[PDB]
Structures are given as C-alpha cells and as structure tokens.
Enzyme design. Structure first.
Site, PDB file in Angstrom:
ATOM      1  N   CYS A 133      76.695 -53.188 -12.118  1.00 18.93           N
ATOM      2  CA  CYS A 133      76.927 -52.573 -10.784  1.00 18.93           C
ATOM      3  C   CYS A 133      78.132 -51.640 -10.844  1.00 18.93           C
ATOM      4  O   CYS A 133      79.266 -52.125 -10.678  1.00 18.93           O
ATOM      5  CB  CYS A 133      77.102 -53.658  -9.723  1.00 18.93           C
ATOM      6  SG  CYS A 133      77.560 -53.030  -8.079  1.00 18.93           S
ATOM      7  N   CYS A 136      80.417 -51.777  -7.736  1.00 16.46           N
ATOM      8  CA  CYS A 136      81.276 -52.988  -7.735  1.00 16.46           C
ATOM      9  C   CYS A 136      82.451 -52.786  -8.709  1.00 16.46           C
ATOM     10  O   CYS A 136      83.523 -53.284  -8.413  1.00 16.46           O
ATOM     11  CB  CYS A 136      80.510 -54.266  -8.073  1.00 16.46           C
ATOM     12  SG  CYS A 136      78.916 -54.522  -7.236  1.00 16.46           S
ATOM     13  N   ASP A 137      82.278 -52.068  -9.817  1.00 17.33           N
ATOM     14  CA  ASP A 137      83.127 -52.217 -11.030  1.00 17.33           C
ATOM     15  C   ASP A 137      83.762 -50.895 -11.489  1.00 17.33           C
ATOM     16  O   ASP A 137      84.674 -50.963 -12.341  1.00 17.33           O
ATOM     17  CB  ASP A 137      82.305 -52.812 -12.185  1.00 17.33           C
ATOM     18  CG  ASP A 137      81.885 -54.268 -11.980  1.00 17.33           C
ATOM     19  OD1 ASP A 137      82.407 -54.894 -11.079  1.00 17.33           O
ATOM     20  OD2 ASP A 137      81.019 -54.766 -12.720  1.00 17.33           O
TER      21      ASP A 137
END
Ligand SMILES: Cc1cc2nc3c(=O)[nH]c(=O)nc-3n(C[C@H](O)[C@H](O)[C@H](O)COP(=O)(O)OP(=O)(O)OC[C@H]3O[C@@H](n4cnc5c(N)ncnc54)[C@H](O)[C@@H]3O)c2cc1C
Ligand SMILES: Cc1cc2nc3c(=O)[nH]c(=O)nc-3n(C[C@H](O)[C@H](O)[C@H](O)COP(=O)(O)OP(=O)(O)OC[C@H]3O[C@@H](n4cnc5c(N)ncnc54)[C@H](O)[C@@H]3O)c2cc1C
Lengths: 314, 314
Positions: A133, A136-137
């Site tokens: 993701c 997300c990251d």
C-alpha cells in the site's frame, strides 16, 4: 444440518453473519486462518471512508468490532479455512481442515486473493522495503530520496507512482505488457513526469538485499532476457483477483474469475449467494462489501423461508 | 459552479458526501430541514445491524457521526430543503429555499416519505398512543393489555401484529384492500391467532382521544360507510414510498415511484445518480443505503473525470 454457512470474515461475511444471526438462523462462519482472518482491512492502517467513524478507525479495530457484533447475535465463528465445497448436491457439503457440515444455503464471501506476488524473498523484505500500500507507506523515512518500483500499469498503479514521486528520487513503474491499462490522462502524466521510468514487458523473478531491499531480479516477458534493478522500495499496485477457486466449475464465473450474480446476491446455483469483492468489478470498498453481505443474508433468509427449510432447533 | 450536489442526509447522502469530499470535489449537500435532517434512522431507537457497533448505537448518534465525517473531509452541509431541480439543462439547476446552484453532476438520495398518515390529530397522539415502529414501542406500559390497531396488510405489518399480541389484549389489523399482501404462512398465522381481527376494505379518517389515543374514525374503502374503533394504541406497518417527487417526469421511475438505475447508481439522465431507499425495492437497510451512496459518489467522480468537468478551484 445448518440453515446457512458463510465462508469469509471480511466486511461482507461479518455483515451477512449479523443479519443471519439476528434472523435466528444460527449461522456458521468459516472465518479463514491461512487465508487471513478479518479480510483485506487487516492489512491497512487507518480507514477514513467507513461511515460512522468521523475520527477514523484502524482496519484491525473495525474488523474486531464486526467479529464481536457477529458473535453477540449468535454466530458460530470458526477460525478455519474451507478446503472444499460440493454445491452439486442438496443439502450442500462444506469441508474445513477440522469438520464437514451440511447446509440448506451457502454465502460465499471469499473476497480477493492476497495482494502479494509470492516471490521467494517476499517475506524477507515485507515491511523492510516491500509494501502492498503506497498510500499507507510512501511517506516513510525508508523511501525518502530512494529509487523505488511500483508494480502494475493500472489506474491505481499510475496514481500510486505519481504519489510516491513526492518522496522518492525516482520511480520505476513495472508493467507486464506493452501498454498501461490506465486512462490516457494518467499515461500523459506518467510519461511526462521526469521522476518516473515505465518498464514495459517486465516481470519480477525475485527481490534481493541484506536487512532491507536493495533490488529486483527482472525478466522481459517476451524473450525472458534477465536484468537487475537497484531499488530500496517496491510497492504493489497490482490488479484485483477475486478468490473464487472454491466454487470454480460449480457456479458461473466471468473471464476474470468474478462470481456472476442476479438480484444483488443470487449465483447460478439456487441457495448459493455471493457477497463482496468476490463479485464486485466496480467499487471494491468495505462499505459496498458490507451492504452486499446484508443483501446475501436477506436473500438466504427469503430462500430458506419460501422453501420451508428452517427448523425450530438444528 | 458545483462539481456535485447531493440531496438528502440519510446514510446514502452522507456516505456519498464522504466519498466525494475525500476525492476533493467539495460536494454541497442539501441535508433537508422540513423533510427531516438525518433520514429514517433519526426516528428509531437503537440500531443493532449497522456493522462496526457491537454494543448498538442510537439512530441519532450514528447519523451525528456520519454528518461529522462528511464535514471533516470538506463537505458543504446546508440544512435546507431542495424545492426544485432542472435536469433537462447542463449544467444542472438545483434550487433550495435559500439559494440556486449549478452542478456538473447530481446525487439524489431523498430516501422514503415520512412513515405517517398525516391524519388531522396525528401530531396530538404522536408518542401518546400513535407509533411508527411496533418493534421499538410494543413492549411499552401504555400498550399493556390494551386494544391496539396495526395499519397495513404487508409482511412487516402481519409480523408486527403477531409481535404486539405478546403485550396487547387484542390487535385490529387494518387493511385498505380485500387481501393481505403478506405470505400465505403469515396469513394462516394471523387468521388463526385468536387475539387478531383483520379489517379488510378499511381506511382511517382520524384519531380521537384526550391526553392519549382512545380510538379511530374509520370508513369502508368501497362504500365510505363510517364506523369508530376503540383502541389505546396504533402502530404504522404501512408500505415503503420512495420520495422521488423532485425528479418525477425528469428521470425514469417505476410504477411505485422508485428511480430506475443501471450499473448500481446511473439514472436515465447522464450525470444524475441515485442512492439508497429511493431506488431500493428489496433491502431497505442503513448498510445497503450507505454502500449505494458510495457507488453514486464513485460513479459521479468517474463521470466528471471522463468528461474533464473538474476545476482546480470552484
Ligand atoms: C491495503 C488495502 C487498503 C484498503 N483500504 C480501504 C479503505 O480505506 N476503505 C475501504 O472501504 N476499502 C479499503 N480496502 C478495500 C477493502 O479492504 C475491501 O473492499 C473489502 O475488505 C472486501 O471485503 P470482502 O468481505 O468482500 O472481502 P475480503 O476483505 O477480501 O475478505 C475475504 C475473507 O474470506 C476469507 N477466505 C478466503 N478464502 C477462504 C476459505 N477457503 N475459507 C475461509 N475463509 C476464506 C479470507 O481469509 C478473508 O477473511 C483496502 C484494501 C487493501 C488491500
Ligand atoms: C422506524 C425505523 C427503523 C429502522 N431501523 C433500521 C435498523 O435498525 N437498521 C437498518 O439498517 N435500517 C433501519 N431502518 C431503515 C433505514 O432507516 C433506511 O433504510 C435508510 O435510512 C435509508 O437511507 P437513505 O439515505 O436512502 O434515505 P433516508 O434515511 O430516507 O434519508 C433521505 C433524506 O433525504 C432528505 N430529503 C428528502 N427530500 C429532500 C429535499 N427535497 N431536500 C433535501 N433533503 C431531502 C430527508 O430529509 C432525509 O434526510 C429503519 C427505518 C425506520 C423508519
């Protein structure tokens, strides 16, 4: 003899369970174990678009709440993988690692296959350069002024590549085919951006590094010619694969493996209902999967009623 | 010039708003005022089947959370009724009591009409013998060994009548037509039950009483012959009416007034999307309405994108 057996513990499975349990059907849920209990939201950070949580909620906390709600209203929850179903006989046959049940109706809510490639060294670099993701990251210290790869050529993948150019020195977009499958706007944006290189006809053999990712072993998908790419990050922007193998050959599937449904949840087999990502070619959200789980449960209850299949005690 | 205007503040409208706001479209939501801000869940007690709330949540608290979430991600929320729309021109025209806007796309999430008859003395006995939810209210002290009426002859209404025989001395089920529209099982259960009298060809003129309900003024729907019925309670088990009057004559409706949709949310007018109870002939749940709101918002975003209708600033 079960009224209904639900397969899967995503938002679809648990919403189905809540509706079936509240209708006094005492649903059995095969939640999964090796398949990953709790579905795709267990693998994310913060959920912000599930209505009723204005502050946001972690994926795991939202799925924990759904499990507690399913259990509260009388669901029988097994942390077990279903190995085999028989939908060609009635009552239907459902087999897990641990038990075999018969059921008047089945709700299949098996969702999408894990978002990963299965590379030999994938578990080695998971959270250590490999991420499923980018949203997300991507802002993590690990990726700051790094060279990184984004796998895939779709709409999600081109947007993810552009996002990550905020943080990375360079993005290598790795496409299996000759053409991106994204919109022409997304393509002009990508092929313009001076910090993106698109690799066409590119597949991934393995990842290498030490304590963290240092690169990829690649091959041309037309000739098999091998090369190496130095990157400190790799993000999966790969497509959605429906996890329909349990029912392959027993219910009608489309070319991509999605279950075909009528009237919101009905499969080609009477008494068998589909919910969630398993049949969704359009939306792929937790809220649409939950609504789908409700439709499958109400559909199963009306099928059981119309055929007079429900008993006072099981 | 709006990217999208959403009409309605039920779970459909707010879920649409959350998705549109998170896509940076700066949706405007006409939430309603005289129509009742927050939709049908504002009129219930405890919601137990909305996934993510294992302890239950009040209707008003769930809808308060959805409003806060819509606002957090950049929705412009107006507590205003839409009086008129023009879907025959582009951009579309939307008029409230207070303002007139143009919009590239419209999400209609106007739900169901209020669950009430509008009798002259209805507001007099509201919460004082008249209830729109037998499941919420049937166990109340007011109805203990009372004679009560349940209005309607459908599946909900026959189940509601039977439920209320746990508490009431006698239930009068009041049906407009000659035949209940419930299943034959429900009919055998009702016509058996010694504590239910079914009145066919029966309409309601008004309620009477003092500080609380004492009875109904009735009429035969075939002859208009009048009679009185002594009851201390009346429960509305009436059918679902979609609130489609804003778009009547401008988008395709079915015979009952439901908006006709393709691909989850698309109306007969390109750029106009429907969500929730407004098009739902099957499920009628808060969770299915929320999923529908998501589908309409994603549908609107893809329409705006494909036609290059979105600007940097409005
Ligand atoms: C990284 C990531 C982030 C996301 N973020 C969001 C977001 O913020 N908001 C949002 O709305 N959506 C988000 N999504 C999408 C969302 O997670 C999915 O749309 C949703 O979870 C699908 O629900 P489902 O119940 O259909 O399937 P899934 O969530 O895929 O669940 C399927 C379940 O079935 C089980 N199963 C499979 N095979 C078997 C078997 N043989 N026996 C037993 N059980 C089995 C699996 O173990 C799993 O528990 C995200 C997805 C990912 C991957
Ligand atoms: C008593 C009761 C109990 C229920 N209990 C449950 C339950 O426990 N669980 C469950 O899942 N479902 C329950 N439901 C059903 C659930 O409330 C509905 O399915 C759901 O609210 C429908 O959502 P919606 O957004 O489509 O429409 P609605 O909730 O009907 O919302 C429509 C909105 O549009 C607004 N509107 C209408 N016309 C205009 C206009 N001209 N301008 C502006 N705004 C306008 C209205 O004011 C309203 O805010 C219950 C319903 C009732 C009546």
């Amino acid at each position: 003899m079960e009224n209904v057996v639900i397969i899967g513990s995503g938002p679809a499975g648990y919403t189905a369970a809540i509706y079936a349990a509240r209708a006094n059907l005492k649903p059995v849920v095969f939640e999964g174990f090796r398949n990953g209990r709790g579905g795709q939201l267990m693998t994310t950070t913060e959920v912000e678009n599930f209505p009723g949580f204005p502050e946001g909620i972690t994926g795991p906390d939202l799925m924990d709440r759904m499990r507690k709600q399913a259990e509260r209203w009388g669901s029988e929850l097994y942390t077990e993988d279903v190995e085999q179903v028989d939908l060609s006989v009635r009552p239907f046959v459902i087999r897990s690692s641990d038990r075999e049940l018969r059921a008047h109706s089945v709700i299949i809510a098996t969702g999408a296959t894990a978002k990963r490639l299965g590379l030999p060294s994938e578990n080695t670099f998971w959270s250590r350069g490999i991420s499923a993701c980018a949203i997300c990251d991507g802002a993590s210290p690990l990726f700051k002024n790094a060279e990184v790869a984004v796998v895939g050529g779709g709409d999600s993948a081109t947007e993810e590549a552009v996002y990550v150019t905020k943080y990375a020195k360079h993005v290598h977009l790795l496409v299996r085919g000759e053409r991106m499958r994204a919109s022409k706007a997304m393509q002009d944006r990508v092929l313009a951006n001076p910090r993106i290189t698109v690799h066409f006809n590119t597949g991934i053999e393995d990842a290498f590094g030490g304590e963290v990712l240092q690169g990829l072993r690649l091959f041309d998908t037309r000739t098999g010619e091998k090369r190496s790419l130095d990157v400190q990050g790799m993000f999966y922007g790969i497509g959605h694969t429906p996890n329909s193998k349990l029912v392959a050959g027993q219910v009608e599937l489309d070319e991509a493996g999605y279950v075909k449904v009528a009237h919101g949840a009905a499969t080609s087999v009477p008494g068998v209902f589909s919910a969630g990502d398993l049949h969704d070619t359009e939306w792929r959200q937790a809220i649409t999967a939950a609504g789908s789980g409700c439709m499958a449960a109400l559909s199963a209850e009306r099928y059981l009623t119309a055929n007079n299949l429900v008993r006072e005690f099981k």
